[PDB]
Amino acid sequence: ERHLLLIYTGGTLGMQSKGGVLVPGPGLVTLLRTLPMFHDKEFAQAQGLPDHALALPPASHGPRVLYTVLECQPLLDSSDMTIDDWIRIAKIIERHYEQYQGFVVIHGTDTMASGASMLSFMLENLHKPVILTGAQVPIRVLWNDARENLLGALLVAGQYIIPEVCLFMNSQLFRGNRVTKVDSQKFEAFCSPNLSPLATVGADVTIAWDLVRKVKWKDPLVVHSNMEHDVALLRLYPGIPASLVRAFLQPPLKGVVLETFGSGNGPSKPDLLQELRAAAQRGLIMVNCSQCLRGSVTPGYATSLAGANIVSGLDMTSEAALAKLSYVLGLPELSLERRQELLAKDLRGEMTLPT
Amino acid sequence: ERHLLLIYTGGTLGMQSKGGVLVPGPGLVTLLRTLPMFHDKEFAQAQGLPDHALALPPASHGPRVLYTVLECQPLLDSSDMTIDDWIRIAKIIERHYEQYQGFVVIHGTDTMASGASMLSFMLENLHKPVILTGAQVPIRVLWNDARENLLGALLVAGQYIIPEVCLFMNSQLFRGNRVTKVDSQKFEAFCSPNLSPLATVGADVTIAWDLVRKVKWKDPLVVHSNMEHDVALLRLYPGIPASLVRAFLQPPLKGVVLETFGSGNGPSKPDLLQELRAAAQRGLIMVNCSQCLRGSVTPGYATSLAGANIVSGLDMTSEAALAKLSYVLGLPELSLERRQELLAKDLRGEMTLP
Amino acid sequence: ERHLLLIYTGGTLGMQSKGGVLVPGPGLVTLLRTLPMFHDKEFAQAQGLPDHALALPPASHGPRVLYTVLECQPLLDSSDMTIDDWIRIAKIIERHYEQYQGFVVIHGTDTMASGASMLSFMLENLHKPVILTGAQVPIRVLWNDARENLLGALLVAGQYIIPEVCLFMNSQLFRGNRVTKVDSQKFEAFCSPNLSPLATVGADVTIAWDLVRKVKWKDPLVVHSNMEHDVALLRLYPGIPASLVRAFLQPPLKGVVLETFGSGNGPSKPDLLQELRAAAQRGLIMVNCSQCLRGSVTPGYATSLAGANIVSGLDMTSEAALAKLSYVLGLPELSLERRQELLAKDLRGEMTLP
Amino acid sequence: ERHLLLIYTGGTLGMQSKGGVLVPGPGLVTLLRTLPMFHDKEFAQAQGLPDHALALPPASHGPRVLYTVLECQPLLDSSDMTIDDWIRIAKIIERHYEQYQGFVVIHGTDTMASGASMLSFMLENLHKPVILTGAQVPIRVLWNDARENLLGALLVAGQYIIPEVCLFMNSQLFRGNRVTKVDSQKFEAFCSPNLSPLATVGADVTIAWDLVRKVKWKDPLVVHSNMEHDVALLRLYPGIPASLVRAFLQPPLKGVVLETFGSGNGPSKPDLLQELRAAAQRGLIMVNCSQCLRGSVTPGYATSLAGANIVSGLDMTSEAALAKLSYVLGLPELSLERRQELLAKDLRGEMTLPT
Numbered sequence A, D: 001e002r003h004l005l006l007i008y009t010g011g012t013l014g015m016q017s018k019g020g021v022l023v024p025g026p027g028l029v030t031l032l033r034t035l036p037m038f039h040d041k042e043f044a045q046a047q048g049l050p051d052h053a054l055a056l057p058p059a060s061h062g063p064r065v066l067y068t069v070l071e072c073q074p075l076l077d078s079s080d081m082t083i084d085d086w087i088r089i090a091k092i093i094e095r096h097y098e099q100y101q102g103f104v105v106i107h108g109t110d111t112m113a114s115g116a117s118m119l120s121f122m123l124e125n126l127h128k129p130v131i132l133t134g135a136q137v138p139i140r141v142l143w144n145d146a147r148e149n150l151l152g153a154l155l156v157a158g159q160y161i162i163p164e165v166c167l168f169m170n171s172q173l174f175r176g177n178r179v180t181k182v183d184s185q186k187f188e189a190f191c192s193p194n195l196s197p198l199a200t201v202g203a204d205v206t207i208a209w210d211l212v213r214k215v216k217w218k219d220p221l222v223v224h225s226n227m228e229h230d231v232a233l234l235r236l237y238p239g240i241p242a243s244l245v246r247a248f249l250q251p252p253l254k255g256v257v258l259e260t261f262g263s264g265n266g267p268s269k270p271d272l273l274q275e276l277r278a279a280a281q282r283g284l285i286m287v288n289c290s291q292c293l294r295g296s297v298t299p300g301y302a303t304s305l306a307g308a309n310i311v312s313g314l315d316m317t318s319e320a321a322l323a324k325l326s327y328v329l330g331l332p333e334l335s336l337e338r339r340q341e342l343l344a345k346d347l348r349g350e351m352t353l354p355t
Numbered sequence B, C: 001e002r003h004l005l006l007i008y009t010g011g012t013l014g015m016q017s018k019g020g021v022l023v024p025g026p027g028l029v030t031l032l033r034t035l036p037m038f039h040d041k042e043f044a045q046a047q048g049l050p051d052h053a054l055a056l057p058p059a060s061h062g063p064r065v066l067y068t069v070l071e072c073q074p075l076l077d078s079s080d081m082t083i084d085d086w087i088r089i090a091k092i093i094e095r096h097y098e099q100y101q102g103f104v105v106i107h108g109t110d111t112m113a114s115g116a117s118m119l120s121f122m123l124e125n126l127h128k129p130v131i132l133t134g135a136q137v138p139i140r141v142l143w144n145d146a147r148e149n150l151l152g153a154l155l156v157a158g159q160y161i162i163p164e165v166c167l168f169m170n171s172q173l174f175r176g177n178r179v180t181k182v183d184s185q186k187f188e189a190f191c192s193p194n195l196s197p198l199a200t201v202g203a204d205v206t207i208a209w210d211l212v213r214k215v216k217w218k219d220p221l222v223v224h225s226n227m228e229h230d231v232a233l234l235r236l237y238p239g240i241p242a243s244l245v246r247a248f249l250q251p252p253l254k255g256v257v258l259e260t261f262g263s264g265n266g267p268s269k270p271d272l273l274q275e276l277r278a279a280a281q282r283g284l285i286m287v288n289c290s291q292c293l294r295g296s297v298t299p300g301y302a303t304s305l306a307g308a309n310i311v312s313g314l315d316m317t318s319e320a321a322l323a324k325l326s327y328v329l330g331l332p333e334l335s336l337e338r339r340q341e342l343l344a345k346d347l348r349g350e351m352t353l354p
């Protein structure tokens, strides 16, 4: 038997209509108990099993999977989530870490990439699966993606030792700090543009063990709740004025992700470049990411943004760059130079270095 | 014979190494003249043809294609382009509109989507093709995507009556105000996420005539050079503070595209919503676009951004929303309400209504 | 309320292990009854509803959906199916046509394209949906594609007036005579290479009404059980000998689909071409389809197969060409010439003319 | 300097209109000479270089590339090619192996996959690139894919040590015995359904060295010209009759590829199974391949074709199965059982043994 904790934080998967719009919906365990694919009553009764704990039917091979449902209060639309909410989730996993073999987190899709990236950094030396999932349609609506998404998450966390924060949707498992939301309506809502999926589900389960990170049983779980809140993301657009960038980078901002064009380029008008220098001199750290979905920041043009306090983000997603920026800036007693060196290193599989 | 104007504005296609980096490179016509696929010397000599004008070899069917090369000065990395640069390009097309049957614009890829979207709006009632193109590798490097991209542009503009600003790359023709750059290295650099390509090239040329806009031969070309410069784009990120949004939306800003999550949602914390209202009261117009590559802004959540001065962008790209915002706000003597009505309408094929 | 007939013919969806391999599995209605997503016990009891008939829970909009399960005997692995089996299925639909508003046919995937194509031709002037479906993993196994495939079929047939034989798999609805099986393991097992899906299911249901065929309420259902059995498929391979083709095309064969290379080409060695002429003189009809997944048979080479009794299959799938050949040859009292004209015309949406 | 042999066998790339249809076209070297991208006159003259030999302009990095054009006679539409034509090509490569560092073979697309597969088997212990290429549109037509396809082949063979028979089309390099033609009109005409491309070309060249086979410098090139001619391919279709299968498998046929449904199934009607057994008793060897594009043949159904003289083709393409059948059957002095063991083994990277 393997025991999982299922953390319900909110999002479309549980949602209910109310006033003609979707809002977060309570009473998940009550529903799941009535669904044979989520709960084997026969096995639970013949094991006089705790009434708070559910049991999946047997799968083909492997151990049996049991799980407990922790429903947070209040439940949130993921659009309203912030760094504090993701810290609370990390703390729930810390508190219950020893009692369970894996974790599944039900989450809204709107900011799921940000949440997976954050938790990836907060949960240092993680040894157990933390699988995020969600749905474009609520589980109470008849025709939905939620049933198969939730079941798959539980089976993956239940049956495999993948020690990463991942995202499971639409029969695929992605590295959490590598995903981005690409479609607002289709069930194939997420994409891992610069890395293969960690796993694919069909008849067979195919896992890329060559990519999955190795369990460091030696080192204990450290949960970083000291994340810098004053970080931002700024998308460059053609002709963005120096005066607007000056205003955006004012104190108390400590770090910013600049989303630049193509292979990492921006306008070279000197007054704009001057505001970036000025901000560097005040101590701001800047990471350069590409607005493009696929590919890497690379020098090579007269317009490439490099220099004073500007670290290349290589092929990182913006969601990951931002979370990493928050992590590194929150570490205590480091120099500006040391902080940039950490930003330029692959800390959780979020970044591919060249040769 | 069909005569085309080839406008070389800059970008990687012509570029040259200098100080170990790529910068814009002059002398295009000189090079093209030496390439048989771009210039038929035999036909030019046997027609004693102007020395500034080149001639493509005969294609399978259709008329012969001639073209003149106008090389702008200075040449630009597209990362440095602004609304004024795109206006200059529209003006070149206006000045020479009667003399040519089509236009091809060589452009850097970094801001090509912004440029195609801008020209789409500036060139009202366009009757002739205006085809943008570029390359991830310069034409002077041996292994490149530039040869085939440029030739395809010239043949499309030269042989078909597609009255739109388009982008031709990697054997596909896209509606210009529908594209976005998705790959910084691969030759398949562009994508039209919410609309099919207008055309595909292989053995056959396949054109989606069901999508191509109709020539309005009744109405003359109007070229809008009064585009509002004070428009911006703002990407929401989780926990973005009200104080930072306040600072961003200060005067003199007149319009902004808010890039929101998923189907058009943002944080509902009241102090943030309050700063959007405040800015609406100052007369700011806001368009809501999705950060997602594919799909549409739709109401349906308690977190959906709608209301005071906020127009839904449906499935518009951000590049297109931003250009449309610039166009509509530049029109003289319209009420705020009329401006929002135009923003909610499909003006150049950039937007699908439900 | 809309009432559907669910015809269970066999295939993996229902299957059971036995002797270490998968074989067809009885007792479908018994299982479905126990699944809340397939049967609303509360509504059935509060309507004292027939015990043989199930009821789907309410969907968002639309009418309620009820359905009856007809489990054929014996059940078949689709690899064993033939024209007679598909005729039987058409006859079941004919016998019960008036009593139901739609049909769903559970079928093995191995020959599902052949079956959908056949039924498409057999069911002339169809007014109601006939949706085929199946699964790579049985519905009794916990992790499967069968639950969502079957439910989607029932909801599509139950809620929409799509008067075609279709295939529903993996959240997509395809025109049946346009599909082919491309993957032996993945859940995305099927592809419609030369036509868009008729519909896609996500948050919204998107239907291509521009493609869906029109209901001919005036004309009654005619069910062709006169399908020619003596038709075959022959795949050319490099250096295939004339003597082997002679043997293949001997009487009593009446029609053959030649699967040729690329854009419709074969070897031009004269003894091979001579055997095709000889067979034409005996009255054999030949349809030329491409071995390629995507694209169209087109003349243009010295190696193109055209002439005596050879009709181009354009962009038809082989499964569709073969079924159409069976249909046309089964029609009574037509001249060879008229038969070839029908083969060259789009009769059920299986073929795009240039 | 690296010197290549360019073997022009025929196909659409060189073709000419004549009587309103495309036929093979002579005079390739004459044309290429006039194209600056294929011939640097300045460098050739300043090196007083042989008049039969051309020279590519300099590429970014790497050595300079020179090449000689050998134009076969007669030139062929690939639809008319046979085993004897592919043997002649292997013999050309054998004769000239020591003089050149690589080979490019221009070939019609209609049977290119069969040709690449054949050469793969014929050229044992190959150490140098043999790159096949072709085009959907002739090089003399203005708007074509031929220029870039031919140039890329020459640059790949000229600049990298990939010791395989490959196919280069539309900016991708595929393992030759893994490809199949999937589109009769689009420039993306080929697909490698069960294996990644060996390489991709863009700004950067990306090579999957993890997949490319290793140079066996110890072992010399052996070229097999004893290939069995009496092999065939038979596609099963629903209700195919026993009497027709009997006629197809008559002597002198020695081997056949059965293209079956899905994961490797056919009809189980006993009279059909009886004809397969009869043919096995006459000494016929049978390989089972899937009609599916992205198929592996796997047992698991009552309809799976396995037994007397029937070898599973796993994920092999039919073109590869058919060539392999011709190779193995042509080897001298082997027992029927030994022949089947070779058919079941990955000999040139054409087959993945499963997980």
Ligand SMILES: N[C@@H](CC(=O)O)C(=O)O
Residues within 6 Å of the ligand: A010, A011, A012, A013, A076, A077, A078, A079, A107, A108, A109, A110, A111, A134, A135, A136, A137, B262, B265, B301, B303
């Ligand atoms: N607005 C929802 C979107 C979803 O879950 O699909 C959320 O993020 O909570």
Ligand SMILES: N[C@@H](CC(=O)O)C(=O)O
Residues within 6 Å of the ligand: A262, A265, A301, A303, B010, B011, B012, B013, B076, B077, B078, B079, B107, B108, B109, B110, B111, B134, B135, B136, B137
């Ligand atoms: N940096 C270049 C990119 C390109 O041309 O591909 C530009 O936009 O001008």
Ligand SMILES: N[C@@H](CC(=O)O)C(=O)O
Residues within 6 Å of the ligand: C010, C011, C012, C013, C076, C077, C078, C079, C107, C108, C109, C110, C111, C134, C135, C136, C137, D262, D265, D301, D303
């Ligand atoms: N062998 C099965 C395949 C399936 O159902 O998926 C059949 O064709 O009956």
Ligand SMILES: N[C@@H](CC(=O)O)C(=O)O
Residues within 6 Å of the ligand: C262, C265, C301, C303, D010, D011, D012, D013, D076, D077, D078, D079, D107, D108, D109, D110, D111, D134, D135, D136, D137
């Ligand atoms: N029929 C031609 C097709 C091509 O080359 O594209 C050949 O195979 O020679």
